[model samples]
Target: RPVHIRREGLDPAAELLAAGALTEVTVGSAVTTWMATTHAVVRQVMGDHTRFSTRRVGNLMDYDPPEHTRLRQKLTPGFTLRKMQRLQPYIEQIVSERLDAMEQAGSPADLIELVANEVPGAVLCELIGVPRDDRSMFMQLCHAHLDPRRAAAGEAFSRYLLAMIARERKEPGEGLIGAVVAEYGDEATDEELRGFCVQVMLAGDDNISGMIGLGVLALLKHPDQIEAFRGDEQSAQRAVDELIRYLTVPYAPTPRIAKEDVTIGDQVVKKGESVICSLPAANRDPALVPDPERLDVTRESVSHVAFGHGVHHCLGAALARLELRTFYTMLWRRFPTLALADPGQENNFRLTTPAYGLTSLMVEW
Candidate 1:
């Protein structure tokens, strides 16, 4: 199985590191896909949307320029640095609450269930203005939708979003959804609004949740690096970025399809072929950083493509960084001696999901 499909540990697969920067590989039997495994080629493909089209509806990743530009520009207000920074207190509060819950649950607590899984949902609820009373219920609906076994849950979640948008339209509030409604007015349709909500919820929840859970694991393994969190703001920021680079959580950005023959890293990706950028592989490229395989939180932040590159770079990057910074610092401060429940036991890695993560992580302080 490909590294993207098989997960035995935290590090990027050796096979992906050994593959050339760009290589043509057969995806299944019929699809010929170009795997962009290095930093340069991946950025080139993501940056040139004209040569490679990504047109779908409901998410920015689906749309190319013009439409993408319009939607992104409108949505930009909600994710500004000021806005993300303003949420620090809330993020800190959320982390504290989760940590308290984990501590209260006694030792050998499952961090994923108590902290990792909960923080992002609550943070998003706060961000999107899901009513405080409705927050827990909304999280349940979202969780159900994420469960593959709950086929009907997806529809329920979509219906709920439509209703939520309708409410926002009737009376705009301070949340991102409400802000869009207030600013854009009817210029943004309910469908577009719902798409934005769904995208934010999906992106904001799983990826950050994964990072919290997986990041803690990484920190526990590299105990010496835990000291980085206690360092000055500049080093701490670099540490957060370094961790993000090392993990490279999302397997790849949405796959891109070639519109015309394009040469990347000495290889030609013909029209109608699919291209998958291996983010983990790119972050692990020695060209991007020295000793790419090792995790060094003290290292200066590299322009790693963990959140991707070009215009399609992660919109939630700021929010993600804030949440992670708050979570890691608060977590370690609260439990100075935090350790795995059973250090030698196997971890439930989300090998087959759209994002790379641990399904559950047990910890004790």
Candidate 2:
């Protein structure tokens, strides 16, 4: 019931940490769950995937290793540093195109729709093998999961994936799906690759989109920091890390059920009980850096869990950084006078989605 994580934008983890790094907090009904609040503890859990199975509930996050390991190993090579580097120009182009579209659409335009939402869908199509024509409809499916009508989108998404898989089987074009199909032959199923593609799309979309929408607002608030970030590539990278740590947009975690009794801090997460970690709180741990809450772009403590830690580290992290850097550098350089159209209203942060991001942000450049 203690879901309010930030009291005036600071981690409520400190209050819970006073009890212990690992404390029992009941989730939903009577199920008491252990929550990890410190950087060390969160790392401990994410690192030791054996004791805490990723397999269970649903999606890739829920699949335990060997199973998770197989999936990751097969899909891993496609997301290499070189592949991401190869993608730099594409992201730059995507960012540029969106900026032009936004500018033409006129000021007081919704940045989330014009730029944020636009970038992810195109990238997913171009890089991830989501059929180009299907992407717009695909994005409509992605957005339709709003409020309570979630299943309608899920069914549509699944059918589209099934059709996509059928096509990939016949002629695997370039993208993650193509690579997997070409390499594995029949060993990898259409469903398996479909799941991976969906995850990649989902992983980068909301988070990066959120970072852009919210990141702009964060920069606008700190003119000096924005200039510092604007200084160079190294400066921009530092700013991106700080912003991710500051916002911790993805926030909470799925219940990582204990496979066996394991001690973290002073408590034992007994076998079969659920363990959850607050990513926002853990990133803000004072142990990670002094003044962990303050937005200091100059700070070099980039070892934040905003992309998570251990084996499950975000595969699209490099690409996300590229997109972010491209976004800030391009936007600010193009429009020196870019400012929030309505600074009075708080951004409509999407708390319901698996990832946190703004629904809309009106901006003028």
Candidate 3:
């Protein structure tokens, strides 16, 4: 419904490239800062934490190490390859159930509401041990938390999570909250636990949902590439990575504030100046890959920043990948001929949000 720096097209690379790799601009509030548009400069900003600080509570991207290292250490075990594999069965079940519901509801349904939006939220519930009945409620709260108009929704979500953590403190369950409590004991405070919950909920939900809804659209637009998902797991993984790079849902990671004067590329960033790394721009940078604009799944694995780069890279990346692979693999298998319900109809897109995604995707098979 709205447009930002990118032009009125699916491609967001053109305008950013014209601005050079690193350029300075006024970002309101009388604050002028630099924005990095290439993969190398972005990685540099995200990688080196000493000169750039990401200090804040509740979100890992808001913190730099030792504290960042410490917070991440407590939750690292829950996101390991083994642990993520354990989530496979549950993820598969959720995807299948959503597909079944879509089938029952018949064609010409909103895939965003029934599948893309629901799947990630449902999986996160299972991961965090949210009660089965309360899962739907929490998911709605999460969506609301992402909306610009709902400030109180985040507070409500936090209060609810704090309560959940309190229960886990007394006696641990089998979910992540329980795992952290049982493992860390009093070492993990309620505030820290709440922060972790907020971060996980916000980070995992919309980003994956955006990937799903937008990914399906990309496949429909590039029918020749649909075969990629139809192939084996390895192929599906590549497709996921490529689509992630092509779409690059996040406009940018948390803006990094220079703790002191630092040289980024050829530009000098003064102390306290903020730098925003445009993910979409970097992913589409020609230097990152040949024909960066094309969505070719056949290419080798892309080291894209869709999940970001460096110490504060997305903690839920493994989990997100697992969910997406399972989703796309099962989706095409269930509906080989899936396409837009009305090809001529214009769909809704989230223009000015933390993440870029389809607000609604009506489809049929």
Candidate 4:
């Protein structure tokens, strides 16, 4: 099964990925711009802050540095290695708890429901200070925000985040949002603070869902690679890295408008033009691997740009890695014979949405 194509049964590449270097395509009415399907070009645009402006990009990602730099500085504390290490035991507990629930839910349980869905929701709730009772509400926003129906989840989510920020400002409890409140005080405006929280939630949402749901199915499909993850930390972490590289979910997250003339690869992209990075293509760039399209969990790390590169690289990457490693290890160690309950069913994965992930997965051991 090809995991990199659009989940909505489409390939919106518009021939750019196969086109040499860069190409100009119309994204909107009378709007002609550049397309970056190569790794060097995509990675170049992502790292070139001077020519690209993230100021109006939307949410936290929509801002350019020193603005984005400041936002990143404020949020870095939550994603540090120490914090993730501190949270390791708790994360382990969360995985173990879910394993028990999965077992109780019986054979042929929708893994999306039992583990993949609940795991990220619970972790994000804890990270962002969403109350236990409101977690279901939070997950609802996660689902609707990314749904193809083009729901009003973004506006509602921002409003809800504003409320959460208000509460955090007053009481100032534990968690990332609270810590930001405690550290910056009145310096960080409600909008800025809320955007930070929203960024993490947006970042945290379906990427994990995709990785967990798709990653599991991929491993099950390649039993030899699954055997490579037999509780070996190095191998497990490698497999997680491989999965991130292999799936490259969301395929294209960062698109930028040229502030001035600049050349990417051999093509000259002029000012006022927009360029989009094909993450999956960049990830599969031959410079990084011999067979970039294949699933080989044991391959040596090759500095793939899956989490993106430069100033806007994923803030929650460490936290994500920690979570994936914990979940993958605990899962396979507990159930070695885990298999898909419905193996031949086409992937009901979410695509062409805010986050790409499995909507439902039936599995049994």
Candidate 5:
């Protein structure tokens, strides 16, 4: 028999993570059941590669064991802390250059258009060895794919990526694409490299920009914390962690499919059940996060599920963190007088989608 459950005021988008944790709903083969929203359950599901398999999830970030292990092993070394740090000088230079451009253009600039969007695009281009001049063309194509309403646009973006991959294969540059080519030789086919490049491009540009924008906004709303972050590096790092916790940009949980019958909490999940893990909710659970609703940069025990957990954890975690930290440092250092352009204007926070960010962050120095 199928069980029916009703959750009120719950964002349909956040249903799975909430269902899994808050309801303690048993997610089995049945139509509906109690779900567990505990850290234990999340850790178990994410960590235990055997029963709750990430292999069924498919993407480079979601796979479990064997295949997950294999792909991750190949991709991991390139995004390590050391390698990401090596790119810091370049990243800083890029941020500085963009800010200079912004200053030259004058005030009332859309930080989103200038800083939020360009930083990741630049980093990705540098990492992929794409020439600086070509970034705008590629970024436009990549942005199109992220639009849910634009199917034709998505296809066009994909074709563009395919074209770039073909060129990169023939004459590889000193980037991750080149590294993969040299390392895998014939093993790294054009299709695979293209897919990887698209993934890298999308991941780098979209998520990081959204996160940084959200963090900046959140800090502005909380003046004391912003002040603390401005004066203290330790506080700034802590604030960044809390911001990541409070505003996990990936609003939609990544979906996973059950390979076989399994029990999540009291529910018996049948074979081939789709499971979505809500990272934002998980990070906000009162049980796991004390005073979950408040934004405290100095809060201790700031463990967050934002980057995910266990085997499927984000490979670019270090790079993302570095980018955020660097962004804050540069922004505050350069424009100590930065502030919201208009406090009366309501922010259009994108909630329905996987990404969480303001449509436009109007600011001035």
Candidate 6:
């Protein structure tokens, strides 16, 4: 008989991560399966660090042991909080300049495209030392790769990244690419460095832009909170954290493959099964978060897995946070009266993607 499981507060991804209700079952099925819904088990699988390998999922979010450590060691220092904080002034300046142009364009603008999308893209490009003029081209390439309907363009995206990597190798600039090249020029191979750069660029391009867009939408929906942000700088920072938690725009599950048999909460997950961790559901778990539905900026516990946990956590997280803080600060300071163009209209929400954000968030002063 098939086991009956109730799908209540359990999100498929969260069930896999929570380590309580769900447990690993059979594998070699349609999509590759494992146990579910056990936080401890998930953490064990993730935290064991030695037995459970991440090679299968390490391109963006999976890697294990010496490999993971080496890659992270090479990359993490560039994205440290201290390093990212230094970019705050420049990020704010970029936001202010973008807003100035938007203000000149008049009201009823799509803030998603204007401020949210543009700010992070510009900041990331500067950080990576990409020419300002070439940034939009790279951004477009990223979008094309993520588009489901387009097959050929995905190949083109890979080609563009490879070309960029080659170009950076020959003539490096003051960006992350240059830093990586300088550090491991003799040790790291071109293909390895290319993979690393591609991963970084993809994270910045695909995830960061959507995050900024979603944060703007959240603020537009919560004007009172936006006003709260305007009233105080500290409140704005908290508001940014709260919005990141509530939206959980990086909706994709981080996948991990089981290397050996593991028992988690009465469930036996056998060897070689794949497990998926859900950040959105875990972020909303009532056990972890009080009133999981409420979006309050002043929550005492602000820890959320919007960025993944463990060693594989986002390297660019600091940069993303800075961009977010700068965007919100400039937004409220410039247009305190900003409101959705059609306040009651249902937002055009996209589903079935790693990133989640409205296609367009129309706003006016």
> Which candidate leads the pack in TM-score?
1
Clashes of 6: 15
lDDT of 3 by residue, 157-266 (tens): 77788888889889798788999999998989888877787778778888998888988888887898888878788988888888888888888888899999998757
Residue range 60-163, candidate 2, lDDT tens digits: 67777777778788888888888887878777887898888877988788888789888976776677777656678877776675434434656787788778
By TM-score, highest first, what's the ranking? 1, 3, 2, 4, 5, 6
Superior candidate under lDDT, 4 versus 5: 4
lDDT of 5 by residue, 1-365 (tens): 11112111111134544454635344454444223355666665666567665442125765557876876666666887788888889899999998887787676878887888789888878887777777787777666666646453767655665666566677766677777766775776666666677667767666798887877787777776666556666766777787787777764345555667777666665676555555666676777777876788888636677787778787777788778888887887788777888877676555443566766888877
How far in Å is the alpha carbon of 315 misplaced in model 6?
Answer: 0.8
Residue 224, model 1: lDDT of 84
Better of 2 and 3 by lDDT: 3
lDDT (10s digit) by residue, model 1, range 114-145: 88888998898889888778788777877677
- Candidate 6 local lDDT, 192-309, one digit each (tens): 6656756776676556666666666666676566765666667767777777777767653466776787665566555776766555655666665778767787875466776766
Candidate 3 clashes: the total is 1
Q: Please list the C-alpha lDDT of all candidates, in the order they appear.
A: 0.84, 0.76, 0.83, 0.75, 0.68, 0.65
- How much is 47 displaced in model 3, in angstroms? 0.7
Q: What is the lDDT of residue 78 in candidate 5?
A: 81
State the weakest 10-residue window (summed lDDT) of model 4.
3-12
| Weakest 10 consecutive residues of candidate 5 by summed lDDT | 1-10
Candidates 1 and 4 compared by lDDT, better number: 1
Give candidate 4 misplaced runs (Cα > 4 Å).
1-17, 26-30, 55-58, 131-134, 141-173
TM value for model 4: 0.87
State the displacement of the C-alpha of residue 200, model 2, in Å, after optimal TM-score superposition.
1.5
Off by over 4 Å in 2: 4-19, 26-30, 131-134, 144-172
Clashes of each: 0, 2, 1, 3, 17, 15
